[PDB]
């Protein structure tokens, strides 16, 4: 009953290691990993919206949640990556 | 045929799907258009980091197919990923090879 | 349909030793096997009780992998690999 | 390096098992333990195989994690042999019997 | 920002210990307690409904949330009180 | 009985609880029984901690419950202690208790 | 440059008392500095999250509730400051 | 009396007490310093400083309790840094 992100994780794997493959057991782990993080980030964004009496989750709540949930450098790059995405999406 | 939202944001992860999953979970009354873009981008980045480290771990073991063991080795050997996933159990991931110095011979 | 009993004894000395070895233990007192059986039973009873609560809540008779994953999360443990 | 005493054997065993990922408790007996425990909570309760496997992966991960902490407790008392008091101390600090 | 239940906590205090008062700092602790438990139960009931693709949170979700969140014995009592209240409420529909 | 609380035999606010459940991002809809069941549980757990803190207050000849009594009640009760294991009660202190090996 | 070392404002007798409340009978002289280290880490983690909440809300005054939310992120639930 | 007798007397006294044990002002100045390294110009509600202190003190006493158990475990009655480190490793607070 959980989302599958397989197609997408395959695509990312090829961008990073065109050479290497991934077993189904491992794909099952990656899917659990994406759902987990998705849930942590959205749950926290939801808490933030509620705390501030805001009815809408925006990319700001997502960003703050990401800062709160991820450790040091990983949070810095994630924030950077999120920002780039929104910037490019907003332009194009 | 319309350009996908993922395409417009320079991503592989599904912006469209992510926005729908965000609405299906009732996390707030409304979900802004940028939220799923920012979220999808973070999920992709994290996925790339782990695949990156895991692919490596697979090479170090003369292997070409990433298995649970490699994901575990990659996570547990990375200080930040290991902290992010501190309460996570990777099925068939095993443990990091490590013996307390006190137990080894002189 | 048979009344199962004493199966905690299926968690044997060698199985327990293999577990301690993976945990990096170099030497084991003979009293840890019964101790281990006791902690394992407690852990299992708790997880199984919660998994079945999810199962019965959904009015099902068959406990699923996801019922266990939800139950483990309840104990603050996140299990990867069974979302399929 | 001591040559092939029980300590040398224990160490080879640690290396062997820290290298593999297979489950270490026999599967059928584990399944029987799971079903036996469930008989209390409810009669006519079935378990999907992957549910039993999920339980086993979680149980073994839990036990070896507990043994790692236990080992640190033994080493703390300048001991190399783990004993029940090491497990109990680890659990106390973990909040499992605090 | 958090709900105040002072008036109710106070009324319950009169039933269980009629001649005992409660301090303002203690009332604040009690308010934090109520809010905390309310959030844990609603949160788990919300997870249950979504897990079962249910759009509505009903007393069955609250009940299951309660059995999951409270230690065994205490849950028995809470479940009983929950059920009683629902029964009285319906019998007087 | 006129109010929903009254109809349920409760002191805790059923109407208010229904409103808080709906306002909280929990589900699209909230049935009428949910808030009565939740209000009853809250009331019952409140009575439990009050009963026990009240007792602790008396054990010290006090007639007023203060944070210290809430802490003593919770920590001396196995069930409440489990329920509230990661909770810190401001101004509650700890349970008087010294490890035996430390005594002369 | 400038000296920012307020952690040393945390006193040896204060630490001694905390340890006594914790049932400790005898204290090595080395645990005082060790204790200052873990306390500084604890506060850094909680204050970092509390100000993250404050900034997100576009405020400049950190409130008790911001600290409570920050404590929850650390797995700690604090009672008494919701008024 | 013996230091042991004095210590035991102190434990009984502090375990019966609920008052904060670190000084108000020095704690407040510590909080301000740390916040300053994240965002300058920040102010703290005074009740926020107090929430931080109640939490910080509860945390430290809790840690001393585990630390104590670790010293007793090694047949010592004196806590040492290695005791704090063991407790923290097991609590998962560090690596
Ligand atoms: Cl979709
Ligand atoms: Cl949509
Ligand atoms: Cl947005
Ligand atoms: Cl690696
Ligand atoms: Cl090694
Ligand atoms: Cl055996
Ligand atoms: Cl052995
Ligand atoms: Cl999953
Ligand atoms: Cl296996
Ligand atoms: Cl069988
Ligand atoms: Cl697990
Ligand atoms: Cl030994
Ligand atoms: Cl022993
Ligand atoms: Cl009644
Ligand atoms: Cl009402
Ligand atoms: Cl209902
Ligand atoms: Cl001080
Ligand atoms: Cl001393
Ligand atoms: Cl706290
Ligand atoms: Cl000593
Ligand atoms: Cl030391
Ligand atoms: Cl440490």
Curated annotation (Swiss-Prot), chain A:
There is a cross-link at residue 88 (Glycyl lysine isopeptide (Lys-Gly) (interchain with G-Cter in ubiquitin)). GO terms for molecular function: DNA binding; protein heterodimerization activity; structural constituent of chromatin. The keyword DNA-binding applies. Monoubiquitination of Lys-88 by the BRE1 gives a specific tag for epigenetic transcriptional activation and is also prerequisite for histone H3 'Lys-4' and 'Lys-79' methylation. It is found in: Nucleus; Chromosome. Its main location: nucleus. It comes from the Eukaryota. The keyword Magnesium does not apply. GO terms for cellular component: nucleosome; nucleus. GO terms for biological process: defense response to bacterium. Keywords: Acetylation, Antibiotic, Antimicrobial, Chromosome, DNA-binding, Isopeptide bond, Nucleosome core, Nucleus, Phosphoprotein, Ubl conjugation. The nucleosome is a histone octamer containing two molecules each of H2A, H2B, H3 and H4 assembled in one H3-H4 heterotetramer and two H2A-H2B heterodimers. The octamer wraps approximately 147 bp of DNA. Core component of nucleosome. Nucleosomes wrap and compact DNA into chromatin, limiting DNA accessibility to the cellular machineries which require DNA as a template. Histones thereby play a central role in transcription regulation, DNA repair, DNA replication and chromosomal stability. DNA accessibility is regulated via a complex set of post-translational modifications of histones, also called histone code, and nucleosome remodeling. Belongs to the histone H2B family. This is Histone H2B 1/2/3/4/6. It comes from Gallus gallus (Chicken).
From Swiss-Prot, chain C:
The modification N6,N6,N6-trimethyllysine is found at residue 2. This is Histone H4. GO terms for molecular function: DNA binding; protein heterodimerization activity; structural constituent of chromatin. The keyword tRNA-binding does not apply. The modification N6-lactoyllysine is found at residues 13, 59, 73. The gene is H4-I. The modification N6-propionyllysine is found at residues 13, 26, 59, 61, 73. Its main location: nucleus. The chain holds residues 20 to 103 of 103 of the full protein. GO terms for cellular component: nucleoplasm; nucleosome. The modification N6-butyryllysine is found at residues 13, 26, 59, 61, 73. The modification N6-(2-hydroxyisobutyryl)lysine is found at residues 13, 26, 41, 59, 61, 73. The modification N6-methylated lysine is found at residue 2. It comes from Gallus gallus (Chicken). Core component of nucleosome. Nucleosomes wrap and compact DNA into chromatin, limiting DNA accessibility to the cellular machineries which require DNA as a template. Histones thereby play a central role in transcription regulation, DNA repair, DNA replication and chromosomal stability. DNA accessibility is regulated via a complex set of post-translational modifications of histones, also called histone code, and nucleosome remodeling. Keywords: Acetylation, Chromosome, Citrullination, DNA-binding, Hydroxylation, Isopeptide bond, Methylation, Nucleosome core, Nucleus, Phosphoprotein, Ubl conjugation. There is a cross-link at residue 73 (Glycyl lysine isopeptide (Lys-Gly) (interchain with G-Cter in ubiquitin)). It is found in: Nucleus; Chromosome. The modification Phosphoserine is found at residue 29.
Curated annotation (Swiss-Prot), chain F:
The keyword Hydrolase does not apply. The keyword Amino-acid biosynthesis does not apply. Coiled coil: none annotated. GO terms for cellular component: nucleosome; nucleus. Its main location: nucleus. GO terms for molecular function: DNA binding; protein heterodimerization activity; structural constituent of chromatin. It comes from the Eukaryota. The modification N5-methylglutamine is found at residue 91. This is Histone H2A-IV. It comes from Gallus gallus.
UniProtKB/Swiss-Prot annotation, chain H:
It comes from the Eukaryota. The modification N6,N6,N6-trimethyllysine is found at residues 16, 39. GO terms for molecular function: DNA binding; protein heterodimerization activity; structural constituent of chromatin. The modification N6-lactoyllysine is found at residues 16, 39. The keyword DNA-binding applies. The modification N6-glutaryllysine is found at residues 16, 39, 75, 82. The modification Phosphotyrosine is found at residue 1. The modification Phosphothreonine is found at residues 40, 67. GO terms for cellular component: nucleosome; nucleus. Acetylation is generally linked to gene activation. Acetylation at Lys-82 (H3K122ac) by EP300/p300 plays a central role in chromatin structure: localizes at the surface of the histone octamer and stimulates transcription, possibly by promoting nucleosome instability. Keywords: Acetylation, ADP-ribosylation, Chromosome, Citrullination, DNA-binding, Hydroxylation, Lipoprotein, Methylation, Nucleosome core, Nucleus, Palmitate, Phosphoprotein, Ubl conjugation. The modification N6-acetyllysine is found at residues 16, 39, 75, 82. The keyword NAD does not apply. The modification N6-crotonyllysine is found at residue 16. The modification Phosphoserine is found at residues 17, 46. The modification N6,N6-dimethyllysine is found at residue 39. The modification N6-succinyllysine is found at residues 16, 39, 82. Disulfide bonds: none annotated. Signal peptide: none annotated. The nucleosome is a histone octamer containing two molecules each of H2A, H2B, H3 and H4 assembled in one H3-H4 heterotetramer and two H2A-H2B heterodimers. The octamer wraps approximately 147 bp of DNA. Interacts with HMGB1. Belongs to the histone H3 family. This is Histone H3.2. It comes from Gallus gallus. The chain holds residues 42 to 136 of 136 of the full protein.
């Amino acid at each position: 009953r959980k989302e599958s992100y397989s197609i997408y994780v395959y695509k990312v794997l090829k961008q990073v290691h065109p050479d290497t493959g991934i077993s189904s057991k491992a794909m099952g782990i990656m899917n659990s990993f994406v759902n987990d993080i998705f849930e942590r980030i959205a749950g926290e964004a939801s808490r933030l919206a509620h705390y501030n009496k805001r009815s809408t989750i925006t990319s700001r709540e997502i960003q703050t949640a990401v800062r709160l949930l991820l450790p040091g450098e990983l949070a810095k790059h994630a924030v950077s990556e999120g920002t780039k995405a929104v910037t490019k999406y907003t332009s194009s | 045929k319309a350009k996908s939202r993922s395409s417009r944001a320079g991503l592989q992860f599904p912006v469209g799907r992510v926005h729908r999953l965000l609405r299906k979970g009732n996390y707030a009354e409304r979900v802004g258009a940028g939220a799923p873009v920012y979220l999808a981008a973070v999920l992709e980045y994290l996925t790339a980091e782990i695949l990156e480290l895991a692919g490596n771990a697979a090479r170090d073991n003369k292997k070409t197919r990433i298995i649970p063991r490699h994901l575990q080795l990659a996570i547990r050997n990375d200080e930040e990923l290991n902290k992010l996933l501190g309460k996570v159990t990777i099925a068939q991931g095993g443990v990091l090879p490590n013996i307390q110095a006190v137990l080894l011979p002189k | 349909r048979k009344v199962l009993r004493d199966n905690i004894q299926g968690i044997t000395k060698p199985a327990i030793r293999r577990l301690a070895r993976r945990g990096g233990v170099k030497r084991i007192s003979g009293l840890i096997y019964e101790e281990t059986r006791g902690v394992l039973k407690v852990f299992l009873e708790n997880v199984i009780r919660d998994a079945v609560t999810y199962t019965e809540h959904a009015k099902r008779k068959t406990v699923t992998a996801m019922d266990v994953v939800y139950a483990l999360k309840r104990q603050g443990r996140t299990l990867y690999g069974f979302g399929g | 390096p001591h040559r092939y005493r029980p300590g040398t054997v224990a160490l080879r065993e640690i290396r062997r098992y820290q290298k593999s990922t297979e489950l270490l408790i026999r599967k059928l007996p584990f399944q029987r333990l799971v079903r036996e425990i469930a008989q209390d909570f409810k009669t006519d309760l079935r378990f999907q195989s992957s549910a039993v496997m999920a339980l086993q992966e979680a149980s073994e991960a839990y036990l070896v994690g507990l043994f790692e902490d236990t080992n640190l407790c033994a080493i703390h008392a300048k001991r190399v042999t783990i004993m029940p008091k090491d497990i109990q101390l680890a659990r106390r600090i973990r909040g499992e019997r605090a």
